[PDB]
Amino acid sequence: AAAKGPVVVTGAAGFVGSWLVRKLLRAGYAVRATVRDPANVGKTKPLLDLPGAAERLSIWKADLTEEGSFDDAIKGCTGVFHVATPMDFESKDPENEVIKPTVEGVLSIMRACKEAGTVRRVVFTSTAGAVNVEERQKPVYDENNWSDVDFCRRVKMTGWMYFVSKTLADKAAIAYAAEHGMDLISVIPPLVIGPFISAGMPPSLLTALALITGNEPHYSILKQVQFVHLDDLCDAEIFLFEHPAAAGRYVCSSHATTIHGLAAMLRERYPEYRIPERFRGIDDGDLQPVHFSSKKLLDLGFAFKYTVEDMYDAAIRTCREKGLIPL
Numbered sequence: 001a002a003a004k005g006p007v008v009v010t011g012a013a014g015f016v017g018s019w020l021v022r023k024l025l026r027a028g029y030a031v032r033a034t035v036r037d038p039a040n041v042g043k044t045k046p047l048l049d050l051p052g053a054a055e056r057l058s059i060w061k062a063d064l065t066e067e068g069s070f071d072d073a074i075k076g077c078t079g080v081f082h083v084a085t086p087m088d089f090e091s092k093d094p095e096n097e098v099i100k101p102t103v104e105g106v107l108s109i110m111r112a113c114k115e116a117g118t119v120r121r122v123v124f125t126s127t128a129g130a131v132n133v134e135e136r137q138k139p140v141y142d143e144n145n146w147s148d149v150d151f152c153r154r155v156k157m158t159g160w161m162y163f164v165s166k167t168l169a170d171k172a173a174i175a176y177a178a179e180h181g182m183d184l185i186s187v188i189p190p191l192v193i194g195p196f197i198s199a200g201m202p203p204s205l206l207t208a209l210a211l212i213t214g215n216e217p218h219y220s221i222l223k224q225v226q227f228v229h230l231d232d233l234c235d236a237e238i239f240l241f242e243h244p245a246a247a248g249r250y251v252c253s254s255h256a257t258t259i260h261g262l263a264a265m266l267r268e269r270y271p272e273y274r275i276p277e278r279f280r281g282i283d284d285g286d287l288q289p290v291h292f293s294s295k296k297l298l299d300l301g302f303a304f305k306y307t308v309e310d311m312y313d314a315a316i317r318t319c320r321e322k323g324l325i326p327l
């Protein structure tokens, strides 16, 4: 059996990327994993240790701020999964140090894909922050809703530079694709929870586990939150790449709840962990869930495998093997 056309995974050393490499290898693909520094044995070793990596995984050096650095890796590939994004949201010129670099990085990826000629489809990983960051929160969001970038630059909530970065990059990738007749899929995941291979806690699990720990600054994120299992997300990205009828934006969210609802589930499911009853910065009002509809993805025939219980069972375990207390 011949390896499925070589596909690139950008940011392969990361939380989402590394697991996507695992799943693409398992599905019979030759995977070209790109990282900013393949000489960093620490970050590269987990990838090379993956099942099937010896035969079908290769590591490539590339940087989103370095025009053309992805040309060699993409050349000859049938698909590109763009998961990398700049994550340094603590600068003093976010427009020029985060926003523009994020949009120029995605556009340069698209250019390299066009030049290659061999790429039939690009799968861009967006974020829920490109959908529902507006002044008036709606009860249901789908792939047709777009964050209000003007609103973000006005009130500058926590993480505003990231919402505008991804929202503008998402819009720019689509516009470039349509202008040059390219096949682009944009996948919108909420907070992603699941196993990780890095020795450090993924930033999404710091939020997900903020109730078990005492990570109070993350409480506002859990106020009205949506979840997806990392495995479901990666499987959906492979599904959407292989389905000939797939096109456009897709929401990949399997669970919506509130901080109060999440506290209850962890209370009944983990008596071993002390779950508070009240959370600073969050009143005792009426909180209803905000739903991210994945109808478009499910209509194509995709099905989620994991529940929110599966997610937290997997996160607590991997973390328990290091960065969190067993309490």
Ligand SMILES: NC(=O)c1ccc[n+]([C@@H]2O[C@H](COP(=O)([O-])OP(=O)(O)OC[C@H]3O[C@@H](n4cnc5c(N)ncnc54)[C@H](OP(=O)(O)O)[C@@H]3O)[C@@H](O)[C@H]2O)c1
Binding pocket: 011, 012, 013, 014, 015, 016, 017, 035, 036, 037, 062, 063, 064, 065, 083, 084, 085, 086, 087, 125, 126, 127, 128, 166, 189, 190, 191, 192, 193, 202, 204
């Ligand atoms: N995890 C979630 O909950 C979540 C939710 C919604 C959307 N997403 C999106 O999923 C994608 C993955 O994020 P993540 O959770 O996996 O964070 P992450 O663990 O930090 O991985 C992201 C990758 O981006 C790479 N990167 C940053 N700047 C780069 C550059 N100039 N050139 C090449 N690579 C660069 C990082 O490599 P280095 O080690 O060299 O910095 C890093 O491996 C992002 O696009 C994110 O917006 C994630």
